[PDB]
C-alpha cells in the first residue's frame, strides 16, 4: 500500500511585515498629508485602508495610494477637511500570513479660505 507519490515545490514564500509604523499627523482644512511604511512580503500582499470603520476608496484626487518595489506603501490625502478626519487602518494579507496597523489623522480649520 501507499502508492501516493507526493510532489513538491522549491519556491520562496514570505509572510508580510511592517518594518516601519505610520505615526500620526495633524493638518489644516485644504492641505495634504502622507502615510507611508515598508512591508517585506513574497509575494506582495493585498492592501486595505479603513477610516472610522468606513471603507476608503482611491477613485478621487483627494485620496491616492501606491506601493513601491521596496515594499513602500504610501497613502496621499489631499484637500482633507474636518469631515474627512478619523482613525485609519491598513491591512496587508498574504496566503503565508497577515498583518494590520492603525494610524491617526487630525484636521483643523484654516483662518482663511479662497473667498469670492
Domains of the chain (ranges; CATH) run 1-116 (2.60.40.10)
CA atoms within 13 A on the CB side of 15: 5
Q: What does the DSSP 8-state code read for residue 10?
A: -
Give the method used: NMR
Distance between CA 40 and CA 96 in Å, rounded?
Answer: 12
Are 104 and 26 a contacting pair, CB within 8 Å?
no
Q: Are 78 and 39 in contact (CB under 8 A)?
A: no
Contacts of 8 (CB under 8 A, 6+ apart): none
Measured torsion, CA atoms of residues 80, 25, 105, 58, in degrees rounded to the nearest 10: 60
CA distances to 7, 9, 86 from 2, rounded to whole Å, are 14, 21, 59
Nearest residue to 64 (alpha-carbon basis) of 53, 49, 54: 49
Amino acid at each position: 500500500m501507499g502508492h501516493h507519490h507526493h510532489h513538491h515545490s522549491h519556491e520562496h514564500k514570505r509572510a508580510p511585515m511592517f518594518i516601519y509604523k505610520p505615526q500620526s499627523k495633524k493638518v489644516l482644512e485644504g492641505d495634504s498629508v502622507k502615510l507611508e511604511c515598508q512591508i517585506s512580503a513574497i509575494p506582495p500582499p493585498k492592501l486595505f485602508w479603513k477610516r472610522n470603520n468606513e471603507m476608503v476608496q482611491f477613485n478621487t484626487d483627494r485620496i491616492s495610494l501606491y506601493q513601491d518595489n521596496t515594499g513602500r506603501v504610501t497613502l496621499l490625502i489631499k484637500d482633507v477637511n474636518k469631515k474627512d478626519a478619523g482613525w485609519y487602518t491598513v491591512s496587508a494579507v498574504n496566503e503565508a500570513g497577515v498583518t494590520t496597523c492603525n494610524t491617526r489623522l487630525d484636521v483643523t480649520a484654516r483662518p482663511n479660505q479662497t473667498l469670492p
